Every structure is written in C-alpha cells, then in structure tokens.
Amino acid sequence: MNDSEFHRLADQLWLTIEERLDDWDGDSDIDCEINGGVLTITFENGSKIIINRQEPLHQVWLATKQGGYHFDLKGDEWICDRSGETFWDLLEQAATQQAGETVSFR
Ligand SMILES: [Eu+3]
Ligand SMILES: [Eu+3]
Ligand SMILES: [Eu+3]
Ligand SMILES: [Eu+3]
Ligand SMILES: [Eu+3]
Secondary structure, three states: OHHHHHHHHHHHHHHHHHHHHHOOOOOOOOEEEEEOOEEEEEOOOOOEEEEEEEHHHOEEEEEOOOOEEEEEEEOOEEEEOOOOOEHHHHHHHHHHHHHOOOOOOO
C-alpha cells in the first residue's frame, strides 16, 4: 500500500533535487549532501535547507531558514499539510531567498 508508494515517490524526489543541484550552473555556490538519507543544501551565506523522510507519516519534511513544512503524497504531487502549497514551490522560494538568486527545479 502506502509504504512502497512512499518509497517510490520519495526516491524520485531525492533524485530530482540531487541532479538539479549537481548541474547547478549559476554564480552562487550551492552544495547538496546526503547524510543518513537526509539531504542538506548549503548556501554561501552559511544558511541551509534540510529535507528528510518521515516514514511513519509517509511525509517529506522541509526545514528552511524561515520555518518547517510537512508534505503529504497527493497523486504524484507533494502538498503542504498546513497550507496546500506544493513542495517544489516552497523549496524554490526558500532556495531563491537563501541563495539571493533564482533557483528552479523546473
Ligand atoms: Eu547532469
Ligand atoms: Eu561548492
Ligand atoms: Eu560536495
Ligand atoms: Eu509503515
Ligand atoms: Eu502519475
């Protein structure tokens, strides 16, 4: 049921994030590491964005300089359980604010 579906969709999310930051071209230095399955993106100002799996809840969590956001699987989409906003939109907003330049995963 939900456990396999969660692993499938989260593994795809991890690869999309990693590959894009792998090919990051812009001026700002952005680094992405995977430690204990957790992704940590580090910006030149020392700020970070942290992305982890919450297995019991089948959620992906995002921790940014401004706050914490929790996402449910919704038809291949990841939706914030407090606001309805999409993961990609909230990640792009946070990364753009913390890099001081446009960061898109699209
Ligand atoms: Eu490549
Ligand atoms: Eu670097
Ligand atoms: Eu590195
Ligand atoms: Eu389970
Ligand atoms: Eu589909």
